[PDB]
Each structure stands twice: as structure tokens, then as C-alpha cells.
Amino acid sequence: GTPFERVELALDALREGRGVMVLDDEDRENEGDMIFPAETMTVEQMALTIRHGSGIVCLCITEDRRKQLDLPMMVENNTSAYGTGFTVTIEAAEGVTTGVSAADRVTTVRAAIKDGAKPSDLNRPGHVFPLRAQAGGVLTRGGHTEATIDLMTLAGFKPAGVLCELTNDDGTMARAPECIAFAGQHNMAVVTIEDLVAYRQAH
């Protein structure tokens, strides 16, 4: 397909309760992140993500939601190679045990994204990793974090999505051909950040 078509197909997939495989630039991370809307991701989708992802399952959120939840950025002097926007980590205050099962990570995501969520609904630290997206989305920063928020908002959801990088069992990160094969195995749409940037520049 074309770039705009891949974006459109990705929005349909998110609306249908399917995941999307998001590939960033080859000259950047060259990684594929599986993403789901925070509002609809299931425990089975979370199990899938832990099984075949890095297991570092992230919750992409806006600056306003970060402030609503009172989640400081993890560090002041961000020296990460890619400037990744990790906040302090989180666990649901209620409805979990140790916080790390697929079910507990989903409970934590739902507590964080609920309308009216308050800081006391989350304990810290925890086993879910929120990432704060920059305003302007992929028009500001071409990361998976912004890409996730932009796809959610374009699909009609709250600007809140769950992401994890796809990993091969031998410990190497999946490259684009592996990400596309995996997307086929799990009926996910595939889209690139480059597609998304072009789409938003036009639209």
C-alpha cells in the first residue's frame, strides 16, 4: 500500500481491537513496537506483549495526564541516547498483587487512564513504565512514544497507548522483516513513523 493507506489501515486496526506494529526510521532505533489503545488493550494482548516483547511495557501519555497523575519525569538530566521520556514507574494501588502479571499490568494501565484518575490511585515505583509524549506528537519528535499518541488520537481514542518493542527469542531485537511477519501472525497493521509524519503534514 501507500503511506496514507498504511496509516488509515492502522487506525482501523486500533478501532477494531487489533494491535499495530510501528516501525521507526532505520537510521534511528530501527525497531518495531507493538501498540494497543490503553482503553481497550486486553489481558491476552498484555500476555502477548510480555511473551514476545522486551517485557518493558510502557504507557504513552500526554503531559496533562502526567501532571494529573503527579508523575515526575524519572530524571532531570536525561542523557539517554534517544531522549526517552520515562516518568517514575507505577502500579495500581488496588486490584493487584505483585503488579507484574499480565492481568496486574492491565489493571495498572486502566487505573492510570481512567477518567478522574488521581495520583493516589497509583503506587510508585511499580512495573508499568509511563512515557510522556511531547506536544505536537511526531511533528515534534519522531519517536514511538509520539507515534503512539498520534495514532490513538487519530483513531478517536484518548491520547494514551501501550507499547513494547518486539524481541526475537534469541535476544536480538526484531528488524522490520521480523516485525512484519509477527504482525501477520497476530493480525496487526504495520505502519512507519515516516508514514505517520507524511500523513499529519498533509492532513
Place this chain on the structure above:
Amino acid sequence: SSFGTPFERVELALDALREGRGVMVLDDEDRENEGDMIFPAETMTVEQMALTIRHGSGIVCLCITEDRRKQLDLPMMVENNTSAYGTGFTVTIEAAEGVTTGVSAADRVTTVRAAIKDGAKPSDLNRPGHVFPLRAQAGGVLTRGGHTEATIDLMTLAGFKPAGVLCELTNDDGTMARAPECIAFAGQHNMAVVTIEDLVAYRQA
């Protein structure tokens, strides 16, 4: 499914660590009821890291002492720790050299090695990152019966640097492995099984 005394289980685990094998550490059934795969930070292989990500939560942690935390200038992640188990997460880390994105098994190992190197400085680690240090409480399992303290105590008793990598064993269906699954897993992977209770008994003696 158990054999022998607590003391032998501990000694078997020390041998396993020296031999380059993992240890499966079970905490109290009334605490987390979880088994963590553990390896010395010094000798853990890329293959072992890949095994840990594949079978574990993927939240692979590096147990360190307070002295090492200070040496690396790693703040505790939160001032007011409200976690269910009071887990000692510091700010997260990535090697400043010799990695790409930080997340591959190879890159996580590189990061662990950078953090534990003799003479490691704060500038050897970028923050935040894909490896999660856990700071052990003074007194080890005699103060806090956690996987973090168990790891440090085991490495210490085995003769290693007080630094160990851990991750909780996860079933493929996303539920956490309980003792029977952890014991079966450890058997299949030639990891020595030991309980925090065993280790408390050993250290008190």
C-alpha cells in the same frame, strides 16, 4: 517438591553461581510467591540474558549495594516509596558506550557490565535506560526477605561482587509462575532452587 536441608540448598546454590549456572530463588508463599532467575552480574552471558527475557517478566534488574548506588550516583527512583513490597528501584540505566538502543540481550549485558566494573563512574551510565537497578537494604535477608537482598547475600556468600541480575519467572500465558512451575523450570535449565527461608536459616546460623 524438595530434598535435603536448607543449608545444603544454600551450598548447592553457591556452587551453581560459581559454576556459571543460574539460581531460582523462591520467596515466601505469603509474600510475592514468586521465583526469580538470578545470575552473577560478573558472569551472566548474553545467552542467559536472552533466556531471562524470554521466560521472565522482561523487567530485568541489577541488584546493587548502597555503596555501589552512591558510587554510580543513582538516586532512588522515588522519595516516597508507596509500592506494595517497598521495592528498591533506583533511576534506570543504559551503558554510555558499546550499545545501540539498550534493549537487546547483548545491550542489557553491556549495561550490567558497565555498572559493576571496578572503578565505574556515574558518567559510564546514561539515564534513563533499559536496565533497572535495585538497591539492597543493609543486613540482607535478615532485614528484608526480598529477592533483592537474597541476590546480594548469595553473591556475597559465593565470593562474587555483591551484584546480581534478577527477573521473575513468568508463564507464557502471562500469569506468574508459582513454586511447582519454578521448580520444574529450574530443573529443565540446570538452575539450583533455593528459598529465601533457606537463606535466612543459613545466615542466622
